[PDB]
Design a protein around this ligand. Structure first.
Ligand code: GDP
Ligand code: MG
Length: 413
């Protein structure tokens, strides 16, 4: 069935390593074996939107994806360590071997020399009904931050009629590299201008959720499961079946409030049996299960909830009451939910929540403080200016980043 095709772009080491469990989950949920490119079993549901993310070739199924990196480390993990070279094939790879050295500026400039090849691969291989792009990358490093920002800017300019969606991973607040605040602010500034929707993931939060319920390749593994769950409304029929622009409209009230906090429940099969339906819905609105490190509840501007599996009104009334919404949103509005018949392969039921919440200003404020604690003392700036990002550029991106925090702060009250 032609239509609603999406091209996924993995940029940087973290973004490509996430692609393993992201594409394995999507393959398994669509009755597809990622190791052989073929269907798992004869059991096939009569309606299935596999073509949204998967290309059907005569030999089998392949991901509609490009794997872009300035070093071959993450690609070697996919092909050599995981032995999935027939799925992550060489025709979908755009690689250099110079590296970004964890500097946003280096990934932006060096990635420009790969832009012509990427744009030609898109126009040569993508269908005309392609609805948009999904960019998966981290913000703390150099490639995923800089090259990812470059790709977000390039795809919006070259394809104005198509949506650009970002799944962006935030650095660890307490245990991450020195240059992470600079790269994060630079990336978030670029995404606010050229992205249609930015779904944020924070390594600080994912570590918290796993420990409190109870191996780096186990974090990106768990991020892929969540990223796949967020795209479920794009891949299955139901009351919440959306496309890229519908997903954006239902959350972006103002053009600047495009940063989304996702939450999912359950996260481990030990919690799956240990939890009922509303246990998962209450945990989705609980800031402990937010994919970004939040301290409080926060005001909800717009949110989209989804049930998956066998769930079978009573859920909404008691929950919508206890949820703090932004001033001026309607009491009958601000929250949309629905049931999806498809379920994750590991859990009998699952609840996902995408929330445009004002508490993201608190998350962005901590990023700004770490940025200022280094920038006000001219620390670690020497290699950004040698790569084409002046000290004045770091400030302008910072001030533009602060304007975003204030917009969310005004909507809160
Ligand atoms: N969750 C997760 N985060 C990662 C992973 N790899 C890197 N990161 C984050 O990304 C930052 C490093 O950027 P990285 O992607 O490794 O370098 P890049 O090639 O320049 O994009 C660090 O601050 C990490 O927090 C991963 O596999 N999973
Ligand atoms: Mg690295």
């Amino acid at each position: 069935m032609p239509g609603r095709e999406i091209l996924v772009l993995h940029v940087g080491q973290g973004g490509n390593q996430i692609g393993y469990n992201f594409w394995k989950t999507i393959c398994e949920e669509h009755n597809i074996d990622i190791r052989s490119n073929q269907r798992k079993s004869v059991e096939e549901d009569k309606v299935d939107y596999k073509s949204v993310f998967l290309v059907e070739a005569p030999d089998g199924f392949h991901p509609r994806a490009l794997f872009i990196d300035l070093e071959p480390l993450a690609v070697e993990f996919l092909v050599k360590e995981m032995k999935l070279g027939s799925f992550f094939s060489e025709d979908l790879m755009v690689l250099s071997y110079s590296g970004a050295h964890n500097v946003w500026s280096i990934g932006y400039q060096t990635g420009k020399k790969l832009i012509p090849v990427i744009l030609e691969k898109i126009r040569d291989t993508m269908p005309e009904t392609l609805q948009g792009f999904l960019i998966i990358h981290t913000l703390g490093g150099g490639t995923g931050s800089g090259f990812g920002s470059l790709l977000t800017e390039t795809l919006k300019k070259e394809f104005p009629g198509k949506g650009v969606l970002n799944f962006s991973v935030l650095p660890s607040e307490v245990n991450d590299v020195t240059l992470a605040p600079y790269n994060t602010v630079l990336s978030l500034n670029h995404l606010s201008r050229f992205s249609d929707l930015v779904v944020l993931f924070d390594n600080t939060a994912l570590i918290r959720i796993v420990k409190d319920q109870l191996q780096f390749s186990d974090l990106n593994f768990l991020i892929g499961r969540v990223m796949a769950s967020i795209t479920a409304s794009l891949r299955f029929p139901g009351p919440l079946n959306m496309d890229l622009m519908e997903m954006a409209h239902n959350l972006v009230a103002l053009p600047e409030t495009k940063f989304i906090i996702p939450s999912v429940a359950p996260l481990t099969k030990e919690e799956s049996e240990m939890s009922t339906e509303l246990d998962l819905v209450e945990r989705c609105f609980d800031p402990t299960h937010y994919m970004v490190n939040c301290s409080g509840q926060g005001k909800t501007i717009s949110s989209v909830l989804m049930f998956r599996g066998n769930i079978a009104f009573s859920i909404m009334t008691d929950i919508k009451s206890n949820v703090a919404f932004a001033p001026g949103v309607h009491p009958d509005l601000g929250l949309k939910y629905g049931i999806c018949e498809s379920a994750p392969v590991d859990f009998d039921k699952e609840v996902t929540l995408l929330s445009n919440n004002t508490i993201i200003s608190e998350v962005f404020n901590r990023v700004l403080e770490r940025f200022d604690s280094l920038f006000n003392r001219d620390w670690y700036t020497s290699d950004y200016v040698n790569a084409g990002t002046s000290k004045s550029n770091l400030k302008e991106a910072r001030d533009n980043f602060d304007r975003i925090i204030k917009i969310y702060k005004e909507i809160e009250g």
